[PDB]
């Protein structure tokens, strides 16, 4: 009980600092080419709001823990993970387009493909939810969920990446961290829930700060006056 709550606190600590940083990042002036980074940072702040509501609920609920509340995290993830995948797409497009691109052009051109990515991701979460609530066995959950995880990342890779080390860092860091949620699924309640508490820091709040640093680095001259 204790170590779950201590990790929830650590996660909440990073979330609050990250939220403050992201808010200031909204007000950094941007050059034409970098406009989409503020768009990304709005959608990472939306993810934070959903994140936080879950954590507050969690630390209140963990006072009188009578049952296994791991499955409640899916009501978070079913909302946050598609948003996270879209921002990843927008960040890859930013990194990889020679001309300035904005999320509207992306969304109007790619909405069908984006729906396939989010459908694959929804199936991953659905299979996890069925396993996490014991409606299918753990082995079927890990194989079915991993299949869809791989499909989601494959679709992302073949459409939006380029073959270079900046892409590999962003893609494979994300891929590994997401896979580690599947790894956590294998563990008993307390250890599982602790891992998810620390994984959220990496999957959400390190991303936001990264985007913040990219914005600051791109705009520092424009900012300074």
Ligand X SMILES: CCCCCCCCCCCCCCCCCCCC
Ligand Y SMILES: CCCCCCCC/C=C\CCCCCCCC(=O)OC[C@H](O)CO
The site for ligand RET (CB under 6 A) is made up of: 77, 80-81, 84, 124-125, 128, 141-142, 145-146, 149, 178-179, 181-182, 185, 200, 203-204
11 binds, among ligand Y, ligand RET, ligand X, none (CB under 5 to 8 A by kind): none
46 binds ligand Y (CB under 6 A): no
Where does residue 157 rank: exposed (0-12), middle (13-18), buried (19+ CB within 10 A)? middle
Sign of torsion over alpha carbons 149, 177, 158, 216:
positive
Interacting positions 180-199 with ligand X (CB under 6 A) = 180, 191, 194-195, 198-199
175 binds, among ligand RET, ligand X, ligand Y, none (CB under 5 to 8 A by kind): ligand X
Mask of contacts with ligand X, 1-40, x by CB under 6 A? Answer: -------------------xx--x--xxx-----------
143 binds ligand X (CB under 6 A): no
Torsion of CA 168, 185, 75, 126, to 10 degrees: 80
94 binds ligand Y (CB under 6 A): yes
Q: Are 146 and 186 in contact (CB under 8 A)?
A: no
> What distance in Å separates the CA atoms of residue 210 and residue 95, rounded to the nearest whole number?
13
176 binds, among ligand X, ligand RET, ligand Y, none (CB under 5 to 8 A by kind): ligand X
DSSP states of 30-48: --GGGHHHHHHHHHHHHHH
Report residue 90 as tokens: 């927008």
Cβ 198 to ligand X shortest distance, Å: 4
The H-or-E segment that residue 73 falls in is helix 73-96
Of 6, 17, 140, 169, which lies in the binding site for ligand Y, with binding defined by CB under 6 A? Answer: 169
The H-or-E segment that residue 67 falls in is none
> What distance in Å separates the CA atoms of residue 181 and residue 200, rounded to the nearest whole number?
9
Per CB under 6 A, residues contacting ligand X are 20-21, 24, 27-29, 150, 153-154, 157, 168, 172, 175-176, 179-180, 191, 194-195, 198-199, 202, 223
Per CB under 6 A, residues contacting ligand Y are 56, 59-60, 94-95, 166, 169-170, 214
């Amino acid at each position: 009980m204790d170590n779950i709550i201590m990790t929830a606190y650590i996660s909440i600590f990073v979330q609050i600092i990250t939220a403050i940083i992201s808010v200031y990042g909204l007000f950094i002036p941007l050059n034409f080419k970098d406009i989409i980074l503020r768009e990304i940072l709005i959608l990472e702040l939306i993810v934070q709001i959903i994140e936080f509501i879950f954590y507050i609920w969690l630390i209140i609920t963990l006072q009188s823990i009578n049952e296994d509340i791991t499955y409640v995290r899916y009501f978070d993830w079913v909302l946050t993970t598609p948003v996270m995948l879209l921002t990843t797409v927008y960040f890859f497009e930013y990194m990889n387009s020679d001309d300035g691109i904005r999320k509207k052009e992306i969304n109007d051109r790619d909405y069908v493909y984006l729906f396939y990515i989010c459908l694959s991701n929804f199936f991953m979460l659905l299979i996890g939810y069925l396993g996490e609530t014991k409606q299918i066995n753990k082995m079927l959950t890990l194989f079915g969920g991993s299949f869809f995880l791989f499909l989601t990342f494959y679709l992302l890779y073949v459409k939006y990446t380029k073959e270079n080390w900046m892409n590999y860092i962003v893609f494979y860091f994300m891929f590994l961290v997401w896979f580690l949620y599947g790894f956590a699924f294998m563990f008993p309640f307390s250890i599982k829930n602790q891992m998810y508490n620390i994984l959220d820091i990496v999957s959400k709040n390190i991303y936001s700060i990264f985007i913040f640093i990219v914005i600051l680095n791109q705009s520092y001259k424009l900012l300074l006056e």
